[model samples]
Target: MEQLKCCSGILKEMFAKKHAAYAWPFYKPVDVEALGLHDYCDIIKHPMDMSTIKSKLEAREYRDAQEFGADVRLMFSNCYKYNPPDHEVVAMARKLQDVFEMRFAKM
Candidate 1:
């Protein structure tokens, strides 16, 4: 629960800083992480810009549920890039993805 909160804080900060979109997804305790799928998402940053995001989502085939899982993973990996640089957030994100991989290794 603490780890999840830490990630949420990262997202909340992004929204406040206008670095992320209001519709940007959140992290769940369960997710698959081995593929580095999260890097494809923008959890800490609102994707740098909308046009690029839209292009990739369309061109790259972004799924709402799967994308969110990846976003949280990437956000956790890149938490330091957040304006405040929360260490706890980083740990939480990493741990969550690790668990995700363990539970959902097949997918």
Candidate 2:
């Protein structure tokens, strides 16, 4: 329970800061149909995002801190696989990852 709160705080601080650039990309899941599934979902088989993680947390679906952290890691890894390394969203992923790591370690 206490650990969950710590994880929650990590996410809150993430978006509470600069939201438009780095935060918005992973704010929600990729819209498969809207984005044309074959063009995206074909290669990126597993997709994850902040909103989904938040929902899972709210639903108490996470069994441990690592579960929450795993989703966060997966979300960013999805960006790396689907997006070009130099892409803006990919850059955001690294930025978010650093922030996530820093906060997650403290938790």
Candidate 3:
């Protein structure tokens, strides 16, 4: 997935399939940037555990599991429509806990 960086405007290729279209003009990385992050390019890249999520989110915000379940559904839905075997769903799920943990931290 070779694409242009928002600021660098440099072409970088990745094995990941979750890139947004050049026309879309934004991606999760953009959100990460808005968080004024350093070192971690994206929270999703980190590997997190369920316990971390439980501790991070408030009791009322403990919907990480539900959200991911829905996200998987949507991921596969797109996969069913467009691509083969599916890559983004698996790639995202592999580290879904990490993403959820990052989100949990914010809660």
lDDT of 3 by residue, 30-107 (tens): 233565635333323333322332233324343444443343234323323332455554444334434433443343
Provide the TM-score for each candidate, comma-separated: 0.31, 0.89, 0.21
Question: Tens digits of per-residue lDDT for model 1 on 6-38?
Answer: 333433443343432322333222132763557
Model 3: how far is 29 from its true place, Å? Answer: 9.2
Pick by lDDT: which candidate is best? 2
Q: Which stretches of candidate 3 lie over 4 Å from their true place?
A: 1-62, 84-107
Segments of candidate 1 deviating more than 4 angstroms: 1-43, 47-69, 78-80, 83-86
**Which whole-number lDDT from 0 to 100 does residue 19 have in model 1?**
31
lDDT of 3 at 2: 15
Candidate 1: residue 64 lDDT (0-100): 47
Better of 2 and 3 by TM-score: 2
**Candidate 1 vs candidate 3, TM-score winner:** 1
